[PDB]
Amino acid sequence: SLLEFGMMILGETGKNPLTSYSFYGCYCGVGGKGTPKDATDRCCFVHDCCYGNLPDCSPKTDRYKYHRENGAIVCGKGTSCENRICECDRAAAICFRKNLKTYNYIYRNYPDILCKEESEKC
């Protein structure tokens, strides 16, 4: 669920997701459209796609367990939905971490009106 996702982002990036990953670019936040602005933004696009591919599940609300093994996120053994939701979240948290090096504060609060390109298909 989004509870686990927030904690995973914090744990993997060191950043509060509410201040770094909730109103960023065209995709990191509510209502994604247009072309992702950069690699971080593309992480959000891909995560949206990953959730959209699970119409048989409830990715935002289905709780799951995870832990770490040798510093890395390992999803718990849950239902098939929990497993797939957890892997979406894990991939995104890792993506954010790998792309910290090009994170740009200038894309915070980027207005959706300028996300004006034909929205990328998953």
Add this chain to the structure above:
Amino acid sequence: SLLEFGMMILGETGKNPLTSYSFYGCYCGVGGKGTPKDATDRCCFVHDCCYGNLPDCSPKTDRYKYHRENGAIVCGKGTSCENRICECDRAAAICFRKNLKTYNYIYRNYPDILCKEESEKC
């Protein structure tokens, strides 16, 4: 949404909600029933009630903003749903903080089969 709720619990208690508040007692976790075991557990019962009183809203998934003023949680100015959802979450995070003094690890992983009393009404 649950993303903000997790961050609020962490910020107010200092504890990871996934390890302290996700499988505790009869109510802190999935599927609440029976009598709350203690004050912390009752926080979870009350939060469940608070969400249940918002059938016109989507408390687990509707994102909202909050910040702090003089160290205390202040909900952002959002829709009426966002405002009410945020206040449910704020009350619960504060409740957990106020009741840290009686938190008991013995109630972690408490089995739902023993939450066997007629479930308390909101």
